[PDB]
Amino acid sequence: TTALVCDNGSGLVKAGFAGDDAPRAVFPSIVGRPRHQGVMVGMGQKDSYVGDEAQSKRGILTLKYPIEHGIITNWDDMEKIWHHTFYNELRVAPEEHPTLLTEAPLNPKANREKMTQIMFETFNVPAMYVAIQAVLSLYASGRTTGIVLDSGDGVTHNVPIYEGYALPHAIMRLDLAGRDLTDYLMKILTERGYSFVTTAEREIVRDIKEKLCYVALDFENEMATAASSSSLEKSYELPDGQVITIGNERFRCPETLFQPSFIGMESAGIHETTYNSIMKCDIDIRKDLYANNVMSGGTTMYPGIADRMQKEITALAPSTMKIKIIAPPERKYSVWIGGSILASLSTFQQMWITKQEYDEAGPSIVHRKCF
């Protein structure tokens, strides 16, 4: 019949059906355990909570993420997140529907092999595939040529694609992160005397940056003017109706993506990583990549991100280049939309790995590479 399309990352699950316009389930990739006691098992409160249940009952729980930096670090909790995805949120038996699954570009091979083993053995699925976030993100724009830049909760990566050919050699990946921006915002907020210690408070700091942070177009002038004018300062009201006021932290937090030395990394910013990835491509490609830069995933969504990115790339590139950066408003769903398209496309249908073909071939078969 029809095929499930699943995009699961360090910050969310996005799952649904091929050919829908948007995901049906979006929920945090979180499992929570009772913190203050071992369970009153005879009365039988749930021993664990997943997604929006764990976000509702936040304060009593400790919130774990099964996926660190795009790598599944706890399989016991990742089987809970897939079970909760299929049975509770989609209301689907996975026995009927093939599934489409997603990874970051450069990733331990066992992270794919164990995911495949679990999806055939603990769940039963007619056929499966694993796809790259950047390829799907490009199909979501419909373009055949461009350099995708994709930044999620756990990873930032770049993949150049030219005329529908794809280049393994110029892939770049950073572990600079949405999380790695949250953890910086916790520290920088501490400068005002707001201390956010627990993981449940970390979810408050995440929501604070999602509402309030933006990319300063010119950082040094906005730092200068924020000291002089309180006009930048803006208010947030906590779950218990206390109130918070935030100043230069508001733009200073997204600055870490352009200057990771703030968090303390050796890295190029996302702009210098994009320019260096373009320059590693052959000189004929480079004009056509400068004509397309494409942004996907939530960390891209800060206000003014593309205006700064263009302002900094224009200063690096030769001045005779047209430099163009592309954002739909839909960017956070772009990878899932690309997977929906690819799964629906009849041309794809031979690429599914059949369970029998896995059974004879053994786990290595998943790594076979296809366009």
Ligand X SMILES: Nc1ncnc2c1ncn2[C@@H]1O[C@H](COP(=O)(O)OP(=O)(O)O)[C@@H](O)[C@H]1O
Ligand Y SMILES: C/C1=C\[C@H](C)C[C@H](C)OC(=O)C[C@H](c2ccc(O)cc2)NC(=O)[C@@H](Cc2c(Br)[nH]c3ccccc23)N(C)C(=O)[C@H](C)NC(=O)[C@@H](C)C1
Q: Enumerate binding residues for Mg ion (CB under 5 A).
A: 9, 152, 297
Q: How many CB atoms lie within 10 A of CB 149?
A: 25
Please identify, using beta-carbon distances, which residue of 15 and 63 lies nearer to its own copies: 63
Would you put residue 161 in left (φ > 0), alpha (ψ -120 to 50) or beta?
Answer: beta
297 interacts with, out of ligand X, its own copies, ligand Y, none, CB within 5 to 8 A per kind: ligand X
Among 11, 105, 160, 339, binds ligand X (CB under 6 A): 11
Question: Contact between 22 and ligand X (CB under 6 A)?
Answer: no
Q: Establish if 48 lies at the interface with its own copies (CB under 8 A).
A: no
Which of 22, 110, 224, 227 is close enough to bind ligand Y by CB under 6 A? 110
Interface pattern 183-212 for its own copies (x via CB under 8 A): ----x--xxxx-x-xxxxx--x--------
Residue in 29, 99, 102, 107 binding ligand Y, rule: CB under 6 A? 107
- CA dihedral angle for residue 70, residue 104, residue 123, residue 96, rounded to 10 degrees: 140
Window 214-253: residues binding its own copies (CB under 8 A): 237-243
- What DSSP string runs through 36-53? SS---TTT---S-EETHH
Asked if residue 261 lies in contact with residue 268, where contact means CB atoms within 8 angstroms, the answer is no
Q: How far is the CB of 107 from its own copies (least distance, A)?
A: 8
The reply on whether position 242 binds ligand Y by CB under 6 A is yes
With beta carbons less than 8 A apart as the criterion, state whether 37 and 45 touch: no
Q: Does 16 bind ligand X (CB under 6 A)?
A: no
Please name which of 319, 327, 337 lies closest in space to residue 301, comparing C-alpha atoms: 327
Q: Which stretch binds ligand Y (CB under 6 A): 52-60, 105-113, 258-266, 346-354?
A: 105-113
Query: Tokens in use for 368?
Result: 């076979």
Does position 146 bind ligand X by CB under 6 A? no
Q: Does 255 bind ligand X (CB under 6 A)?
A: no
Q: Distance between CA 291 and CA 293 in Å, rounded?
A: 7
By CB under 6 A, tell whether 60 contacts ligand Y: no
Name the CA radius of gyration of the chain, rounded.
22
Nearer to ligand X, 302 or 348 (CB): 302
**Tokens 């003017």 sit at which residue?**
225
CB of 242 to ligand Y, least distance (A): 5
User: Mind spelling out the 3-state secondary structure of 211-268?
Assistant: HHCCCCCCHHHHHHHHHHCHHHCEEEECCCCCEEEECCHHHHHHHHHHCCCCCCCCCC
The secondary structure element, H or E, covering residue 304 is none
Q: Check binding of 71 to its own copies (CB under 8 A).
A: yes
Q: What is the separation, in whole angstroms, between the first and last Cα of the chain?
A: 23
Decide if residue 279 touches ligand Y (CB under 6 A): no
* Nearest residue (CB) to its own copies, 231 versus 350: 350
Smallest Cα–Cα separation from 80: which of 129, 133, 126, 13? Answer: 13
Query: Of 153, 222, 249, 255, which one interacts with ligand X (CB under 6 A)?
Result: 153
Residues contacting ligand Y: total by CB under 6 A: 17
The answer to whether the beta carbons of residues 108 and 13 sit under 8 Å apart is no
Subset of residues 294 to 313 that bind its own copies, contact rule: CB under 8 A: none
Nearer residue to ligand Y within complex by CB, 179 or 308: 179
- Name the packing angle between helices 305-316 and 249-258 (round to 10°): 40
Which amino acid would we find at residue 181?
A: L
Mask: binding to ligand X, 205-224, rule CB under 6 A, as x and -? Answer: -x---x--------------
> Residue 141 is encoded by which pair of tokens?
């724009």
Residues that bind ligand X (CB under 6 A): 9-12, 14, 152-153, 178, 206, 210, 297-299, 301-302, 332
Residues that bind its own copies (CB under 8 A): 34-37, 40, 42-43, 45, 57-60, 62, 71, 106-111, 162-169, 175, 187, 190-193, 195, 197-201, 204, 237-243, 263-264, 266-267, 281-287, 290, 317-321, 347, 350-351, 370-371
